[PDB]
Design a protein around this nucleic acid. Structure first.
Ligand SMILES: [Mg+2]
Ligand SMILES: [Mg+2]
Ligand SMILES: [Mg+2]
Ligand SMILES: [Mg+2]
Ligand SMILES: [Mg+2]
Ligand SMILES: [Mg+2]
Ligand SMILES: [Mg+2]
Ligand SMILES: [Mg+2]
Lengths: 74, 167, 170, 258
RNA sequence: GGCUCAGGACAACGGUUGCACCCCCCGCGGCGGUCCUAGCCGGACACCGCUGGCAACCCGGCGCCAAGACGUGCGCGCAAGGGCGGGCGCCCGGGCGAGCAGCGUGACGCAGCGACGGCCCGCCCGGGCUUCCGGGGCAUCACCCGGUCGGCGCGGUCGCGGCGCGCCGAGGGCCCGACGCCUGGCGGAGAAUCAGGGUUCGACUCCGGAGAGCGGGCCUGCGAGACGGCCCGCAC
């Protein structure tokens, strides 16, 4: 009343009573939210990569012994 | 309610101990599931909130299960036809009630669809060429909400065959 | 040859137990997969046994026996943990259970003297042991097996005939 | 029977080695769960108020802690009831004071000042090795910390050096005859000695025989034997070297100080 | 947390074991891969406005609006459970005194996390049960018990177990005092008395147990058979 909306801007005329009072908009994404989500994704990827590297080097070690772990399927 | 505390029993000498507290919630029990074979109606499984937030599911009605032929390493999901033997009581058999240790007949189609072409135990194959195969239940319905098992093999198969043949 | 004879006896027994139609259920060892008994060769073991681990030795009867007992400490599924004790046999009337008598002393400070006291302790007796009244037994602690039983027999020493009853703290 | 967990603590029911006055009050602080347990710890407020004396009340300690003025193993802690334990690092940058929490011969917690070179690590006792999810080898310690993928050469009851900044193992000391140790439980807390014998009983406790530098010999169970190096301590220890004087000598020292 | 000691006499309680029969919030440290509109999803209620019932207590109907609320859910296969996988008289690593854990593989099932990322693991405090020893008086109470004793099987439970049910057998306790009855009976750490040996008490400061008029039942929640929480009967 005035999906996939890139700008995310909006209006502000609202209603006035003197002090101007308008409800704060919710469900809006700007720089802070976009940046936060991107940082979280990067952190999760980094964590997974570090754990995989640690597993690989541990497996490279123990060449003179036996191991038992859940083989990654798919 | 229902409880399994030992304060309401007698002592090893047969004496009355006496009671010193009211009932406690740690020592409670619940009414049995009495899981029924299906033979508004369909697979129905309930969920129970147990101590510690843990979840327990009891089956009330079910019709299928996973069964394994250990000797040949063959496993499929098959439909259960009816319960034919139970050691605890014959009333459970009449009602077609599923519990661990029940002896049941399953459909042969998933097995015969691929069998009857390789050398194996003669008896299982004779069952395969028919309509049903004798089997057993190994899971606990009422605790895990499932009814799995295995196909009978040797001496136990002979025991149960000799048991149910005269009937 | 020796090994082949053992499997025959183990294989044979499972079939009489299947011919005992008076019994309501088929008793089997949980660990063993029923199916090995149709293998004509002897490349799969048919009986399961373990070691107690406190320096005790597994009887030959258990290894070469043909009995099923889920409460036996050698062929069953129970574990020994806790206190080991000694006593004498007082009664042996139940199917697989006995009553053990333990004797000890109690001191009374006022009179500077002692009293003799005894207690009765019930235990499970596996078919691998033969026991009569007056025998000496070693019992190991297990999980609750029934209303009055928390012990299992692990060693038996015979006692001679008509031997006088004696106060024997152990 | 209480219907749930306990949140309070009577003063008379508190541990003796805390040294709390009978008339201080009805109550004593109840430490919160953390690195160390109730009977092998001491709350932060007790150190900050009844020893160092930088505060005179609960409230002042609360302000000091919520203003971020104390670091425990490199991490600021704002809980007045946070538990402090053995071989912990206590640093206060505002006054350039650094202490390591150890035991005195009498059997109480003491603050041994340290240097910058040795404050980047701590010693931990490994008492449990287990397999976690996916069969991954793990390892736990006395301060409630777990490390994944430990060296196979590390066994139980060993001692481990870990950098404070990064929880990575550097070197490890094995539990063996001839290694300097420190007793952390029982009648012999705070004594230092070398292992002379090890005797095990099947299904029961394992007893360790130790000899002090002066030739005295004492026994204790393995559950409270801490390795602190290879024949020489790896960290700075109190001025005294784990020697417990007899009552006579302690009385002489008291009279001298009088 | 605070109050009290009615009830309960192989029980509670005190010391000593164990769970290889168990559950656990906060906190600390780790770990963090999820089968088949993602510049940000959908619909509501509360407060509030209009119209109202009733002595009181109590609420009704209509109406626009928010979420770290509810629901759906973007994603590198992953919850519970189930079958198979060691020996040849015994003993001489992930881990034990102890064949316990984990893993692979053939089938089932898609549980939990995810519109500002927490499912899971370990420790800690706490709880539940459990071994051994101690644990009032009366013989004008001498024989007692019949799920009482044991075995097999299922069910239920966080979990072992006659805890419950079916079948089988017959057992278990007793002058080293059973069973029954009585108590103006909570227990211990301790108190009074005073050569030494002891006698009597222990409502009350600390620990532990039990209860909230009597008797029962239950929801929420990690945790209560809770009563300054709800439902019923009885007496007020
Ligand atoms: Mg998906
Ligand atoms: Mg949501
Ligand atoms: Mg009373
Ligand atoms: Mg009290
Ligand atoms: Mg209460
Ligand atoms: Mg109540
Ligand atoms: Mg009131
Ligand atoms: Mg209250």
């Amino acid at each position: 009343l005035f999906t996939k909306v890139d700008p995310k801007d909006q209006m502000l005329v609202c209603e006035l009573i003197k002090k101007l009072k308008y409800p704060k908009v919710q469900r809006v994404v700007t720089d802070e939210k976009y940046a936060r989500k991107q940082r979280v994704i990067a952190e999760k990827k980094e964590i997974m990569r570090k754990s995989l590297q640690q597993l690989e080097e541990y497996k490279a070690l123990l060449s003179r012994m036996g191991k038992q772990h859940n083989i990654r399927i798919y | 309610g229902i409880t399994h505390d030992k304060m309401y029993k007698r002592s090893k000498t047969g004496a009355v101990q006496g009671k010193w507290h009211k009932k406690r919630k740690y020592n409670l029990g619940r009414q049995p599931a009495n899981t029924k074979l299906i033979v508004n109606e369909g697979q129905k499984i309930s969920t129970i909130r147990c101590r510690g937030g843990n979840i327990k599911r009891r089956a009330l009605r079910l019709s299928h299960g996973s069964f394994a032929w250990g000797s040949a390493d063959i496993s499929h999901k098959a439909r259960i036809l009816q319960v034919v033997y139970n050691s605890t009581s014959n009333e459970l058999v009449r009602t077609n009630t599923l519990v661990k240790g029940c002896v049941v007949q399953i459909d042969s189609a998933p097995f015969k669809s691929a069998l009857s072409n390789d050398t194996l135990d003669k008896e299982i194959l004779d069952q395969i060429r028919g309509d049903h195969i004798l089997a057993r239940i190994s899971s606990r319905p009422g605790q895990v909400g499932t009814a799995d098992g295995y196909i009978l093999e040797g001496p136990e198969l002979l025991f149960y065959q000799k048991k149910l043949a005269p009937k | 040859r020796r090994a082949l004879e053992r499997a025959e006896t183990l294989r044979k027994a499972a079939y009489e137990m299947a011919e005992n139609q008076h019994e309501r259920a088929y008793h089997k060892q949980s660990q063993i997969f029923q199916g090995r008994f149709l293998r004509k060769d002897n490349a799969r073991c048919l009986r399961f046994y373990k070691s107690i681990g406190m320096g005790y030795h597994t009887p030959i009867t258990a290894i070469n026996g043909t009995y099923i007992d889920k409460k036996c400490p050698f062929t069953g599924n129970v574990s020994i943990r806790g206190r080991i004790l000694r006593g004498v046999v007082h009664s042996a009337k139940m199917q697989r259970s006995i009553i053990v008598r333990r004797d000890y002393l109690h001191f009374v400070q006022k009179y500077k003297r002692y009293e003799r006291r005894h207690k009765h302790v019930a235990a499970h007796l596996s078919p691998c042991f033969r026991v009569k009244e007056g025998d000496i037994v070693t019992i190991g602690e297990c999980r609750p097996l029934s209303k009055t039983i928390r012990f299992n027999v692990i060693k038996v020493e015979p006692v001679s005939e008509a031997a006088k009853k004696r106060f024997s703290p152990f | 029977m209480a219907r749930g967990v306990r949140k309070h603590l009577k003063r008379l029911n508190a541990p003796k080695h805390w040294l709390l006055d009978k008339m201080g009050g009805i109550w004593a602080p109840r430490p919160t769960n953390g690195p160390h347990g109730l009977r092998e710890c001491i709350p932060l407020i007790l150190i900050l108020r009844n020893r160092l004396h930088y505060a005179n009340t609960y409230a002042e300690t609360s302000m000091i802690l919520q203003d971020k003025n104390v670091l425990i193993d490199g991490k600021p802690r704002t809980d007045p009831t946070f538990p402090v334990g053995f071989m912990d690092v206590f640093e206060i940058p505002k006054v350039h004071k650094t202490f390591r929490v150890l035991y005195d011969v009498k059997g109480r917690f003491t603050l041994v000042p340290i240097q910058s070179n040795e404050a980047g690590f701590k010693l931990c006792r490994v008492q449990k090795i287990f397999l976690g999810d996916k069969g991954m080898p793990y390892l736990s310690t006395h301060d409630a910390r777990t490390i994944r993928f430990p060296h196979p050469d590390i066994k139980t009851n060993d001692t481990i050096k870990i950098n404070l900044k990064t929880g990575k193992i550097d070197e490890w000391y094995k539990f063996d005859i001839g290694k300097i140790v420190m007793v952390t439980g029982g009648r012999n807390c705070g004594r230092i000695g070398t292992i002379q014998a090890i005797d095990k009983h099947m299904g029961s406790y394992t007893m360790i025989r130790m000899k002090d530098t002066e030739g005295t010999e004492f026994l204790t169970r393995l559950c409270n034997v801490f390795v602190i190096g290879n024949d020489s301590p790896a960290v700075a220890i109190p001025t005294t070297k784990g020697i417990r004087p007899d009552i006579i000598k302690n009385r002489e020292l008291r009279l001298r100080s009088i």
